[PDB]
Amino acid sequence: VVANYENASMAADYIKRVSNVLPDIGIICGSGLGKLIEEIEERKVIPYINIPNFPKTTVAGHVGNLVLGSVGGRKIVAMQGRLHMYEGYSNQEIALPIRVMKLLGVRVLLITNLAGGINRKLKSGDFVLIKGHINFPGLGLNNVLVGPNQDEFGPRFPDLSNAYDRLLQQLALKIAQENDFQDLVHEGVYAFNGGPTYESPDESNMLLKLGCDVVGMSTVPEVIIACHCGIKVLAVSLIANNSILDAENDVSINHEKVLAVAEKRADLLQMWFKEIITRLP
Amino acid sequence: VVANYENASMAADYIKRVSNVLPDIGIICGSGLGKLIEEIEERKVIPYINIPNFPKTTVAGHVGNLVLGSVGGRKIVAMQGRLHMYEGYSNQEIALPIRVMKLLGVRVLLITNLAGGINRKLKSGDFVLIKGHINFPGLGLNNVLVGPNQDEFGPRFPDLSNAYDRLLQQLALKIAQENDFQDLVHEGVYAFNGGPTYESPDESNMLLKLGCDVVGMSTVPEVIIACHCGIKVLAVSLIANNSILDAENDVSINHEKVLAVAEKRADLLQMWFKEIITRLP
Amino acid sequence: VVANYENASMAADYIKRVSNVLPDIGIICGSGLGKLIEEIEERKVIPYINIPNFPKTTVAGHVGNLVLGSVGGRKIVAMQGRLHMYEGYSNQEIALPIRVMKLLGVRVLLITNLAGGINRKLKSGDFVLIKGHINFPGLGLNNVLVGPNQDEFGPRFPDLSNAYDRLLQQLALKIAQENDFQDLVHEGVYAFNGGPTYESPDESNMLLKLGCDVVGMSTVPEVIIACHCGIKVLAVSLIANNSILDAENDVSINHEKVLAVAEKRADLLQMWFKEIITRLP
Numbered sequence: 001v002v003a004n005y006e007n008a009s010m011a012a013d014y015i016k017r018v019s020n021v022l023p024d025i026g027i028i029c030g031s032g033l034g035k036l037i038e039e040i041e042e043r044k045v046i047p048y049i050n051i052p053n054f055p056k057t058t059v060a061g062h063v064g065n066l067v068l069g070s071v072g073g074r075k076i077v078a079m080q081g082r083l084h085m086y087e088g089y090s091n092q093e094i095a096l097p098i099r100v101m102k103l104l105g106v107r108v109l110l111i112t113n114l115a116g117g118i119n120r121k122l123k124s125g126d127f128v129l130i131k132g133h134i135n136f137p138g139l140g141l142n143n144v145l146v147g148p149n150q151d152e153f154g155p156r157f158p159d160l161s162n163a164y165d166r167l168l169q170q171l172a173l174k175i176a177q178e179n180d181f182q183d184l185v186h187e188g189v190y191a192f193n194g195g196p197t198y199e200s201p202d203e204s205n206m207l208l209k210l211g212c213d214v215v216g217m218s219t220v221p222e223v224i225i226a227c228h229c230g231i232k233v234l235a236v237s238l239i240a241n242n243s244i245l246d247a248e249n250d251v252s253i254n255h256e257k258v259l260a261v262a263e264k265r266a267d268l269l270q271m272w273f274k275e276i277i278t279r280l281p
Numbered sequence: 282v283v284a285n286y287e288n289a290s291m292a293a294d295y296i297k298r299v300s301n302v303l304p305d306i307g308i309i310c311g312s313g314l315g316k317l318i319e320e321i322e323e324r325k326v327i328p329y330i331n332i333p334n335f336p337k338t339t340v341a342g343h344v345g346n347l348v349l350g351s352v353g354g355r356k357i358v359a360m361q362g363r364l365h366m367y368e369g370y371s372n373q374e375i376a377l378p379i380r381v382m383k384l385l386g387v388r389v390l391l392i393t394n395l396a397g398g399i400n401r402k403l404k405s406g407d408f409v410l411i412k413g414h415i416n417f418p419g420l421g422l423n424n425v426l427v428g429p430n431q432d433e434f435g436p437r438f439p440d441l442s443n444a445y446d447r448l449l450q451q452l453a454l455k456i457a458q459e460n461d462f463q464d465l466v467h468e469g470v471y472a473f474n475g476g477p478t479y480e481s482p483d484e485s486n487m488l489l490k491l492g493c494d495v496v497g498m499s500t501v502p503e504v505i506i507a508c509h510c511g512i513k514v515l516a517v518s519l520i521a522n523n524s525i526l527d528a529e530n531d532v533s534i535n536h537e538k539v540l541a542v543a544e545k546r547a548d549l550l551q552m553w554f555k556e557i558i559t560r561l562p
Numbered sequence: 563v564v565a566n567y568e569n570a571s572m573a574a575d576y577i578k579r580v581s582n583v584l585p586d587i588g589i590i591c592g593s594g595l596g597k598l599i600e601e602i603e604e605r606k607v608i609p610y611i612n613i614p615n616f617p618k619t620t621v622a623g624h625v626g627n628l629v630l631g632s633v634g635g636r637k638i639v640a641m642q643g644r645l646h647m648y649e650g651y652s653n654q655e656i657a658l659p660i661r662v663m664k665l666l667g668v669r670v671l672l673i674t675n676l677a678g679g680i681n682r683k684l685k686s687g688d689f690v691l692i693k694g695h696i697n698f699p700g701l702g703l704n705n706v707l708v709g710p711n712q713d714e715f716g717p718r719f720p721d722l723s724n725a726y727d728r729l730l731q732q733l734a735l736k737i738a739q740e741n742d743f744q745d746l747v748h749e750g751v752y753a754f755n756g757g758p759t760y761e762s763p764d765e766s767n768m769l770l771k772l773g774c775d776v777v778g779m780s781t782v783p784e785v786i787i788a789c790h791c792g793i794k795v796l797a798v799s800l801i802a803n804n805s806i807l808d809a810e811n812d813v814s815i816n817h818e819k820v821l822a823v824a825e826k827r828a829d830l831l832q833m834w835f836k837e838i839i840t841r842l843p
């Protein structure tokens with residue numbers, strides 16, 4: 001199924017019939033960082049299997065729902081169950097849910113992820129507001145937009161220079177200052193490692209040379225589809241480790257350690273994003 | 282359809298029956314840089330749809346013809362309507378028209394493109410004679426030659442060290458000096474960004490660190506297929522912008538600005554390439 | 563055919579019925595470096611075409627056998643006929659033979675390849691013990707593990723920091739010292755160029771900037787599948803040329819020169835790996 005105007009329209013029509021919510025904010029949450037979705041008020045849960053043209057996710061299993069409702073007096077739509085390109089999903093499968101958000105009325109997309117620290121001053125448990133990216137799949141002919149252009153959504157050759165909205169970064173930082181955790185908050189450039197292997201020690205050293213602050217396996221495909229169709233983005237990385245220190249010390253990293261960091265910062269991140277939603281212009 | 286000897290031979294036989302031109306020069310022109318094709322003398326226009334085994338291009342639409350005839354007393358074949366890998370065409374579809382050129386007798390391929398400037402001394406409207414490349418898709422397992430080797434055309438493991446003919450570069454520069462525009466002409470290394478998004482500001486900064494002079498979304502696949510089968514290449518970039526200055530100044534870029542630069546330099550480039558054709562050894 | 567537990571089990575059951583050898587060591591040898599396979603004692607040769615679910619290799623042709631038997635009193639299994647990703651094989655086809663080795667009992671995998679020198683002190687004919695890698699296909703969404711995870715073999719997100727066993731490197735070097743050729747033996751970081759074109763001169767210069775010691779078109783996919791399922795690896799490159807000196811001098815490289823270097827070092831490499839096998843803990 002192609003992520004075209006007709007197929008996205010059929011999905012949007014179904015969602016509008018069953019939900020009665022017109023959202024202007026979309027959210028996609030990282031692993032272990034989804035508790036905010038469980039606090040959506042007056043909510044409607046829509047299994048992906050029920051939505052015309054949504055991708056099939058039963059090989060990976062686990063949860064897969066769209067959730068619509070209210071947070072802080074604002075109307076939102078959340079993806080509960082994220083699609084990642086290292087799982088083998090196609091460009092068209094990743095893009096269709098974001099283009100459906102666009103047709104439902106979404107103007108702002110908020111994204112979180114887990115990442116490895118490259119910049120030497122980043123510690124486990126820090127947050128990084130993403131200000132730009134280095135897209136190794138895109139340079140290498142695996143960009144999410146390779147294929148025919150869907151002209152109803154955006155241009156053949158998009159400019160990504162404003163993909164990460166400056167004013168949304170400024171608001172996120174202001175709220176951190178108001179709540180006395182600004183010492184945890186940095187800004188930086190995100191390297192997209194297609195995955196699913198963690199960056200090797202020598203790849204980490206290369207990313208340091210090339211101007212990268214953090215590295216991870218998600219987010220950039222969604223950012224590009226959003227920018228192509230005019231949706232503003234705020235993207236925040238939670239740092240699980242410093243990959244450069246681990247390379248210099250011959251120390252390992254695993255999904256388990258990553259998940260313990262997520263649990264340590266989950267409640268803080270949930271409160272931060274609830275306040276960002278409440279305060280968005 | 283595979284770009285093999287039998288399928289290329291069937292295409293070449295059809296073209297020879299309808300055209301009566303045996304070309305020794307091939308041309309592929311960049312966006313907005315095709316006016317020379319309209320001045321081919323005693324010409325024959327062959328729609329791609331008529332040629333056995335040529336790729337289907339009706340999803341992207343627009344023009345698609347092979348044009349054969351005379352320029353400056355030389356016999357040539359031009360692609361009118363270019364295939365790009367960011368559109369989703371396969372390795373085999375890009376390669377077949379170049380291998381058909383080889384079987385028709387082509388010994389020299391001339392290519393133009395639009396590109397972004399990385400080297401700080403490159404201005405909008407400058408020309409860059411390409412002397413080498415950095416092939417991010419090739420490093421990343423998306424090389425145009427991934428697949429079985431077609432042994433009738435070339436070796437399993439080609440050497441690209443002489444892909445950009447030195448004597449053709451020297452002739453292009455000499456003609457620029459004769460016509461008093463050598464101050465517009467530079468040489469440099471071309472980075473292949475698979476596309477279709479323009480290079481991000483942070484990707485531009487990375488390419489500066491890595492020794493790149495210009496960046497674009499075409500040309501390298503065609504160069505590799507030509508080199509594999511023994512066709513000499515001259516490739517020239519028209520600079521639409523300096524991506525490094527735009528990154529430092531927080532300034533944007535779009536297809537519209539690119540096309541205005543093409544219109545400014547179209548007539549000069551047309552006269553330059555007509556004289557190169559006339560003068561080729 | 564997917565490289566899953568059921569399909570690998572059916573292959574392993576067939577091999578066990580016909581061979582009566584339970585191997586604990588696997589070997590994969592580079593081009594021209596396979597003479598050790600012909601000296602396996604009490605051996606059983608199993609054509610790939612006979613093994614359930616093994617990949618089809620008749621488009622590339624040449625040899626394709628699994629060979630089981632004894633070397634230095636140890637039980638081994640060798641791939642005679644290597645699968646390379648530049649030939650167009652899928653992730654699943656490369657991975658299945660290594661996962662079959664795992665189910666047969668293999669605990670250690672020994673690999674050789676031919677490579678180009680980037681580090682300026684590497685000469686044609688030198689050996690490089692690989693201590694780490696830079697995986698351009700992996701960064702660019704062409705990692706060998708892209709797809710569903712096969713949980714019976716390993717984790718969704720593997721750590722590669724110990725992919726190249728330190729103690730096996732130390733043993734290889736000790737044997738070189740015992741036999742007075744340690745002056746040929748170096749250590750270094752391997753860049754994976756997907757191929758099949760040799761690295762261009764400007765790509766070689768980039769790899770120098772990024773901390774690479776050698777570059778080649780194989781090995782990293784097999785290393786990653788082995789590490790994912792807990793098999794220890796020793797990987798050794800034979801240097802065919804110094805790509806940086808050749809770039810600075812405008813000198814060429816070809817498969818023929820590479821193969822003459824292989825013939826010069828074949829007997830030494832064969833004796834080295836026979837002694838490594840004999841001595842493995």
Ligand SMILES: NC1Cc2ccccc2C1
Pocket residue numbers: 175179268271272273275
């Ligand atoms: N002050 C409330 C809003 C907010 C934002 C971030 C962290 C904690 C809290 C509590």
Ligand SMILES: NC1Cc2ccccc2C1
Pocket residue numbers: 456460549552553554556
């Ligand atoms: N002198 C003619 C040949 C040529 C080459 C380049 C630009 C203008 C002209 C006119």
Ligand SMILES: NC1Cc2ccccc2C1
Pocket residue numbers: 737741830833834835837
């Ligand atoms: N000493 C034997 C074992 C070995 C290892 C490496 C090279 C030659 C030989 C001969």
